[PDB]
Amino acid sequence: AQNPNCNIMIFHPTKEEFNDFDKYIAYMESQGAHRAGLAKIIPPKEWKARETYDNISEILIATPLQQVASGRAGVFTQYHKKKKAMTVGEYRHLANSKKYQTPPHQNFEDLERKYWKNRIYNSPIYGADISGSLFDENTKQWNLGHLGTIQDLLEKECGVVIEGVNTPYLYFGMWKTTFAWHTEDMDLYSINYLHLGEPKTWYVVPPEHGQRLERLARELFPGSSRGCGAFLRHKVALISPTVLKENGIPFNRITQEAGEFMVTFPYGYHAGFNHGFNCAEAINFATPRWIDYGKMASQCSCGEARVTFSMDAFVRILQPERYDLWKRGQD
Numbered sequence: 005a006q007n008p009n010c011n012i013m014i015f016h017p018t019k020e021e022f023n024d025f026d027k028y029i030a031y032m033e034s035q036g037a038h039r040a041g042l043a044k045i046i047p048p049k050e051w052k053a054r055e056t057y058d059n060i061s062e063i064l065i066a067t068p069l070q071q072v073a074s075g076r077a078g079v080f081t082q083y084h085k086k087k088k089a090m091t092v093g094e095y096r097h098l099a100n101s102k103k104y105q106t107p108p109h110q111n112f113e114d115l116e117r118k119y120w121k122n123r124i125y126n127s128p129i130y131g132a133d134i135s136g137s138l139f140d141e142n143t144k145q146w147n148l149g150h151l152g153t154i155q156d157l158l159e160k161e162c163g164v165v166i167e168g169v170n171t172p173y174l175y176f177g178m179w180k181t182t183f184a185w186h187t188e189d190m191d192l193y194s195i196n197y198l199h200l201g202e203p204k205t206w207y208v209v210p211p212e213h214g215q216r217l218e219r220l221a222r223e224l225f226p227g228s229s230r231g232c233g234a235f236l237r238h239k240v241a242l243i244s245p246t247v248l249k250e251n252g253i254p255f256n257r258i259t260q261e262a263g264e265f266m267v268t269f270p271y272g273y274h275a276g277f278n279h280g281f282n283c284a285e286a287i288n289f290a291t292p293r294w295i296d297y298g299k300m301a302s303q304c305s306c307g308e309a310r311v312t313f314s315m316d317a318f319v320r321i322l323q324p325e326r327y328d329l330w331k332r333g334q335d
């Protein structure tokens with residue numbers, strides 16, 4: 005069995021190996037990469053996502069989200085308070101202001117220590133979940149707006165044609181902006197490209213151990229757990245590395261830098277934070293190996309998780325017993 009300790013693997017494809025996206029995912033899996041839940045892919049030196057980032061300031065962040073925490077430093081939830089619209093140039097200036105800018109630090113480990121010590125005492129503003137792409141149309145390799153769609157994969161594997169579309173999302177971050185512990189919708193893969201700016205630190209639980217994280221979360225967030233049998237689908241709970249280690253939960257960590265891709269694998273729980281002003285692009289995708297995870301994915305039916313149009317068909321076809329209850333949650 006490849007990668008039996010479930011370590012995060014880092015790949016360096018050549019320009020020739022970068023042509024065929026599906027083939028390279030399957031290669032990484034042949035080497036055991038999925039067992040970690042997360043892999044890093046450094047593009048060949050010949051590749052670029054676009055020519056420059058000099059002209060992005062007029063993108064609009066229609067609903068910036070202020071991330072307000074509650075709890076203790078290592079065990080907390082966050083809620084998202086909606087703020088007035090601002091442009092990417094306005095948000096970058098805000099991120100760089102004395103109130104929001106990254107503090108002085110020695111290295112990534114010192115900054116990580118400061119994040120976990122101090123996150124809860126501040127409310128950073130995240131420009132998350134913005135439909136769109138920064139890949140040039142002429143970039144043919146690993147262009148997250150040109151991937152094979154999840155609806156086409158379901159149709160190729162299972163024969164059933166379904167409605168829905170699959171497009172990328174932009175994330176504009178600042179110091180301390182946070183992504184809570186989650187797996188993807190329907191335990192899909194995700195791919196994330198960090199276009200510019202400061203790093204993103206990731207934490208991940210191997211898929212084979214995801215239920216250990218769920219049991220810890222039910223203990224640490226006991227009211228939330230009574231409210232919903234899949235409350236991590238709400239994407240609000242944070243648990244620090246120190247707390248995970250104290251409770252014996254297997255995990256790994258890695259920092260992504262500008263110019264690098266990360267792939268999350270089906271049922272790989274992940275969480276993390278941004279180091280300073282940045283911009284990432286991400287999208288969900290599927291492969292044949294996903295289908296079995298989709299069939300078994302938990303679902304929130306309490307009403308909180310509220311998701312895209314295109315998840316309807318995935319539930320309806322892969323989980324017909326759950327469909328009626330889940331759809332009530334959506335309505």
Ligand SMILES: O=C(O)CNC(=O)C(=O)O
Pocket residue numbers: 132175182183194195196268274284286287
């Ligand atoms: O970058 C973020 O805020 C969150 N990203 C992801 O969870 C992902 O790419 O799967």
Ligand SMILES: [Mg+2]
Pocket residue numbers: 059060061062063
């Ligand atoms: Mg612009």
Ligand code: NI
Pocket residue numbers: 186187188194268274
């Ligand atoms: Ni994710």
Ligand SMILES: [Zn+2]
Pocket residue numbers: 231232233234235237238304305306307308309
């Ligand atoms: Zn719920």
